[PDB]
Structure formats: C-alpha cells, structure tokens
Amino acid sequence: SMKIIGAGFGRTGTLSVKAALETLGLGPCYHMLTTFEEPGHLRLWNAVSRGERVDWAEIFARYRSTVDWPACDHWETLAKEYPEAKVLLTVRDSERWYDSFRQTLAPLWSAESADPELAEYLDLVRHITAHTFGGRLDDRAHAIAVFEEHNRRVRASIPSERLLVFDVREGWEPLCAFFGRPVPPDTPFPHLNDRAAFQELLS
C-alpha cells in the first residue's frame, strides 16, 4: 500500500522531497520523471486523465510515496483509495513557484513535437493545462490563482492530523517529526535540480 500521497504541484521542490522521503525509508517515491522510466505508465496516466477506470496498483504497486504531477491532481481519489496513507502538500512562495513553472515547464507544455516518444507526455500535460489551468499557462495572475486555490482545496479537505503542509525551506525537522523517522545529525537537506530533464526533452 502507498504510505504518502503527494498533493503539491510540480515546481515545489519535488525532486528534493523525493530524495528526502527515500532517505527516511518512505520510498520508493514516484515523481513526474518516473513516468519516463516505467514502460506504459504514461498510457495509464492518460487513461486516468480521460476518466477511465484504472487499477491504481498497475501504477503504484512498487512505490510507497508520490510527489509532483501527475498524481497531485488526483489527491482526492488517491486519499480515498489508500485511506491509511498520509497526505503531503508541498508548497512554495507563489511568485517563486510561477517563476520556476514558467522557466521550466511552460515552454515544454506548450510545445509540439514530431517525436512520437514525447507524444504521450504532451497528451498528459495538455490535459493538465486544460483541466487544471483553464487552458492558459502564460498568465502569472491566473496561474498563481490556480496554485493558491489548489492548496486551499487540499487543506480544506484532508483533516489536519493526516496532512503535512511542507516547504523545502523548512528542512528536515517537520518531515522527521510528522513521520517519526530520524535523519543523522548534521545532514543537509537535499537541494536537487531537475530543470535540465525538462528543458532537454524537446531537443
């Protein structure tokens, strides 16, 4: 069974959170980039996005946690599928979130590719764009409004004993306290960068 359902949007330090959760023994942790490493997973996520019934174990059987897209948009159904899992809402200053989103994802998500190998990913992020962002990615006011409303929704649905709201600026102490898992003294909190994986996809 899944232990942790990550409900925060991408660009909230998710690759660093992924690493931190794995260090605490709470992985393997799924991330957006896992969909490229798991054969057939983008097909399954597109089926989920279309509203089809998919057995969640076909995606998550070998995982114990998830962060980022694509799963964050499905936090409500995943929290009901895995009732014992905790929910982790990764957050960030809204201006910095949008800066990172427009520097990292908006060009890619807005692109066309002849490459049949990006086609499934593009289908998925086109769905997210339509369903979550109302068809616009290049508008800071609207995108920040979407981010802030998403975070409000999660906080208003999941009971506060089951939800941890976390920004990577806070470091280890809140994860370790919420999950009751130690990290060695003087361990720096991971600050990892996945920008190149997305920026290099098109080329």
Query: Of the two residues 23 and 129, which places its CB atom closer to Mg ion in the complex?
Result: 23
Residues 121 and 41: beta-carbon distance below 8 Å:
no
> What residues numbered 16-35 form the site for Mg ion, per CB under 5 A?
19, 22-23
CA distance between the termini of the chain: 38
Give the separation between CA 190 and CA 199, rounded to whole angstroms: 21
What is the identity of the amino acid at 185?
Answer: P
Binding region for Mg ion (CB under 5 A) out of 12-20, 39-47, 52-60, 118-126: 12-20
Query: Of the two residues 19 and 71, which places its CB atom closer to Mg ion in the complex?
Result: 19
Length of the chain: 203
Number of residues that bind Mg ion (CB under 5 A): 3
Query: Of the two residues 19 and 168, which places its CB atom closer to Mg ion in the complex?
Result: 19
Can you say whether residue 180 is alpha, beta or left, with left for phi > 0 and alpha for psi between -120 and 50 degrees?
left
* x/- map, 41-80, Mg ion, by CB under 5 A: ----------------------------------------
Give the separation between CA 194 and CA 116, rounded to whole angstroms: 23
- Could you tell me the smallest distance in angstroms from the CB atom of residue 188 to Mg ion? 12
Residue ranges binding Mg ion (CB under 5 A)? 19, 22-23
